[PDB]
């Protein structure tokens, strides 16, 4: 008998496992420094300018 | 008349013994213990 615990299972799964993208990526004009991953794209503006 | 040696009354003790063929279930007096579940139409937490 886990009927009351599936309703808790849905709401806990959805909150834990669902992620949106924030205004910086989708709406706001943020530079690549704050829009992109710094561990990889930290010299992409400098090199693309080159 | 027949006089016979018997066991003296103070050197024996009657002890009541209760003989059972099986251990009764938890809901022994309940004909349908599964009607608490079959009638939970709102759910159980």
With beta carbons less than 8 A apart as the criterion, state whether A35 and A25 touch. Answer: yes
With beta carbons less than 8 A apart as the criterion, state whether A45 and A33 touch. Answer: yes
Q: Name residue, tokens 């300018």.
A: A49
Q: A1 and B45 in contact by Cβ < 8 A?
A: no
Sign of the four-CA dihedral B14, B20, B25, B29: negative
Distance CA B45, CA A6 (A): 10
Stated in angstroms to one decimal place, the resolution of this structure is 3.2
Q: What's the gap in Å between the CA of A17 and the closest CA on chain B?
A: 24
Distance CA B33, CA B41 (A): 16
Two structure tokens written together for B22: 């099986």
Q: What's the gap in Å between the CA of B38 and the closest CA on chain A?
A: 12
The three-state secondary structure class of B9 is: helix
């Amino acid at each position: 008998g886990g009927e009351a615990q599936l309703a808790m299972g849905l709401n806990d799964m959805v909150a834990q496992c669902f992620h949106m993208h924030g205004a910086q990526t989708t709406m706001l004009s943020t530079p690549i420094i704050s829009r992109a991953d710094f561990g990889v794209y930290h010299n992409v503006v400098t090199n693309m300018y080159r | 008349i027949k006089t016979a040696p018997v066991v003296p009354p103070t050197e024996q003790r009657d002890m009541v013994q209760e003989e059972r063929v099986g251990t009764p279930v938890k809901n022994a007096g309940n004909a349908n213990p599964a009607a608490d579940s079959d009638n939970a139409t709102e759910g159980v937490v």
